[PDB]
Enzyme design. Structure first.
Site, PDB file in Angstrom:
ATOM      1  N   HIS B 222       0.856  -1.185   0.000  1.00 18.87           N
ATOM      2  CA  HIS B 222       0.000   0.000   0.000  1.00 18.87           C
ATOM      3  C   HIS B 222       0.894   1.238   0.000  1.00 18.87           C
ATOM      4  O   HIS B 222       0.696   2.161  -0.792  1.00 18.87           O
ATOM      5  CB  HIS B 222      -0.885  -0.004   1.246  1.00 18.87           C
ATOM      6  CG  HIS B 222      -1.721   1.226   1.414  1.00 18.87           C
ATOM      7  ND1 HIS B 222      -3.067   1.260   1.120  1.00 18.87           N
ATOM      8  CD2 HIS B 222      -1.412   2.461   1.892  1.00 18.87           C
ATOM      9  CE1 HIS B 222      -3.552   2.453   1.414  1.00 18.87           C
ATOM     10  NE2 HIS B 222      -2.572   3.199   1.884  1.00 18.87           N
ATOM     11  N   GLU B 223       1.891   1.254   0.880  1.00 18.18           N
ATOM     12  CA  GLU B 223       2.786   2.401   0.937  1.00 18.18           C
ATOM     13  C   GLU B 223       3.636   2.519  -0.328  1.00 18.18           C
ATOM     14  O   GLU B 223       3.910   3.625  -0.781  1.00 18.18           O
ATOM     15  CB  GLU B 223       3.671   2.333   2.185  1.00 18.18           C
ATOM     16  CG  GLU B 223       2.902   2.477   3.496  1.00 18.18           C
ATOM     17  CD  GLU B 223       1.982   3.688   3.518  1.00 18.18           C
ATOM     18  OE1 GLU B 223       2.377   4.754   3.000  1.00 18.18           O
ATOM     19  OE2 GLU B 223       0.862   3.575   4.070  1.00 18.18           O
ATOM     20  N   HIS B 226       1.705   4.338  -2.964  1.00 20.66           N
ATOM     21  CA  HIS B 226       1.721   5.777  -2.758  1.00 20.66           C
ATOM     22  C   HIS B 226       3.070   6.280  -3.265  1.00 20.66           C
ATOM     23  O   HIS B 226       3.134   7.292  -3.947  1.00 20.66           O
ATOM     24  CB  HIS B 226       1.619   6.146  -1.274  1.00 20.66           C
ATOM     25  CG  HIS B 226       0.243   6.044  -0.702  1.00 20.66           C
ATOM     26  ND1 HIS B 226      -0.845   6.705  -1.232  1.00 20.66           N
ATOM     27  CD2 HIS B 226      -0.206   5.423   0.420  1.00 20.66           C
ATOM     28  CE1 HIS B 226      -1.900   6.505  -0.461  1.00 20.66           C
ATOM     29  NE2 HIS B 226      -1.537   5.732   0.546  1.00 20.66           N
ATOM     30  N   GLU B 261      -6.063   8.187  -1.228  1.00 20.82           N
ATOM     31  CA  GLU B 261      -6.214   6.945  -0.470  1.00 20.82           C
ATOM     32  C   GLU B 261      -7.201   6.002  -1.158  1.00 20.82           C
ATOM     33  O   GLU B 261      -6.962   4.796  -1.248  1.00 20.82           O
ATOM     34  CB  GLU B 261      -6.680   7.236   0.963  1.00 20.82           C
ATOM     35  CG  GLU B 261      -5.610   7.850   1.853  1.00 20.82           C
ATOM     36  CD  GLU B 261      -4.427   6.923   2.103  1.00 20.82           C
ATOM     37  OE1 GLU B 261      -4.495   5.729   1.752  1.00 20.82           O
ATOM     38  OE2 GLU B 261      -3.423   7.396   2.670  1.00 20.82           O
TER      39      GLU B 261
HETATM   40 ZN   LIG Z   1      -2.551   5.243   2.394  1.00 18.34          ZN
END
Ligand SMILES: [Zn+2]
Ligand code: NA
EC number: 3.4.24.69
Lengths: 4, 422
Positions: B222-223, B226, B261
């Site tokens: 997830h990171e 980003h 997000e």
């Molecule tokens: Zn996030």
């Protein structure tokens, strides 16, 4: 970010 | 393997891939021991009291003041054994991610996503932006500047506040102007979150103790997603949010969730971003890429001697997938831009990684965390690159039994319950  | 060397925290420094470094936080700091696990990627087994000089206090504030989803322990990651385990854990997760086609694709995009050389004031010269570098102590004790794309570092005071951080520019918004910037991911492989198998329970702040544990590989992925957006400078401004109207509990509190997000999670969450705005963002970044192409067209000289002008112009030609006409000028092709933009924003998502890892995971970003667990994924008897917690040929192989904290209780220690505290 993970959030709530 | 993604990481060709099995580093030990105590391995002697060599000033190349094991060295003491300083990061450009515009402040002072004692050098910290870091490890280069792959081209352009470093790991710093330290709590992050560096990227933000105002967040250098790990001590837990008064019990009276400390929000819901948070966990403090000023002593975590302070010993060499912990740092050794941290390094091995982060490495293992990179291998788990890289072992999937999707992870291999994402990590390749990340390595190719070198932050743009736009730190020059004269439009005729290409110069690197120093905050996209780290200072490495060489064997002779002198410092040398090395460009990098990603740094994995331990969390700051709130241990479970994982996030991407990067140094800004006096004028340029590097994560939103197509340029990109070195990404520092606050993360820990030593803790994970508990969620619930029933959607109605998982999205309710008053129910559930956190029966299932999130696979840390998904959390890191997830990171990394980003990071991918930010390295290509296409992150959505955090002020662009979705006024949640699909969860009465979020609504009654007027909670808002950023589009960045929702995009990152993917799946149905991504659909909360209307077509009109998606088109707006897409055109905005297409234009930013156009500006980068034109800046490269005007570049007549290069600053420094770490690479040739031709090399760097080619480096970004490949990063942004630009086209080159007969003359030799770069241009952005609509099809190629859309393909890359779509890859970074729709193919690389948390939801898709869940499909590749074959794990149970929150079904939406719009839920409520239940708890935080202490874990140890380093021992192969606990977690593997191939199966995570759901070890093949064992009672944990099926039905996500490995992630079931009640069945595989020896692998999880609940540290704090969040339910009822929102
Ligand atoms: Zn996030
Ligand atoms: Na929250």
């Amino acid at each position: 970010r993970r959030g709530c | 393997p993604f990481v060709n060397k099995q580093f030990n925290y105590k391995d002697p420094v060599n000033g190349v891939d094991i060295a003491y470094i300083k990061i450009p936080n515009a402040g002072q700091m004692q050098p910290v021991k870091a490890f280069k696990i792959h081209n352009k990627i470093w790991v710093i087994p330290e709590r992050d009291t560096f990227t933000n000089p105002e967040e250098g206090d790990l001590n837990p504030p008064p019990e009276a003041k400390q929000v819901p989803v948070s966990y403090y322990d000023s002593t975590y990651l302070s010993t060499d054994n912990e740092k050794d385990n941290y390094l091995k854990g982060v490495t293992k997760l990179f291998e788990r991610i890289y072992s999937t086609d999707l992870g291999r694709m994402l990590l390749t995009s990340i390595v190719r996503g070198i932050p743009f050389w736009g730190g020059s004031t004269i439009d005729t010269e290409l110069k690197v932006i120093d905050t996209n570098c780290i200072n490495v102590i060489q064997p002779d004790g002198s410092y040398r500047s090395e460009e990098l794309n990603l740094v994995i570092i331990g969390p700051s005071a709130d241990i479970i506040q994982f996030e991407c951080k990067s140094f800004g520019h006096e004028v340029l918004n590097l994560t939103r102007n197509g340029y990109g910037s070195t990404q520092y991911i606050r993360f820990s492989p030593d803790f994970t979150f508990g969620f619930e198998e029933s959607l109605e329970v998982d999205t309710n702040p008053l129910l559930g103790a956190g029966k299932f544990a999130t696979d840390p590989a998904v959390t890191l992925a997830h990171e990394l997603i980003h990071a991918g957006h930010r390295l290509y400078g296409i992150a959505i401004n955090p002020n662009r949010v979705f006024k949640v109207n699909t969860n009465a509990y979020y609504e009654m509190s007027g909670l808002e969730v950023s589009f960045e997000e929702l995009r990152t999670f993917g799946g149905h969450d991504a659909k909360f971003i209307d077509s009109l705005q998606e088109n707006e963002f897409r055109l905005y970044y297409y234009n930013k890429f156009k500006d980068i192409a034109s800046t490269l067209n005007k570049a007549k000289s290069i600053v420094g001697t770490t690479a040739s002008l031709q090399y760097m112009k080619n480096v970004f030609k490949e990063k942004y997938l630009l086209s080159e006409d007969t003359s030799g000028k770069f241009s952005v092709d609509k099809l190629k831009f859309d393909k890359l933009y779509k890859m970074l924003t729709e193919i690389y998502t948390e939801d898709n990684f869940v499909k590749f890892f074959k794990v149970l995971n929150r079904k939406t970003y719009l839920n409520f965390d239940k708890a935080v667990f202490k874990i140890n994924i380093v021992p192969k008897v606990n977690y593997t690159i191939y199966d995570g917690f759901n070890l093949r040929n064992t009672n944990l192989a099926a039905n996500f039994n490995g992630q079931n904290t009640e069945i595989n209780n020896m692998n999880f220690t609940k540290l704090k319950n969040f339910t009822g505290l929102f």
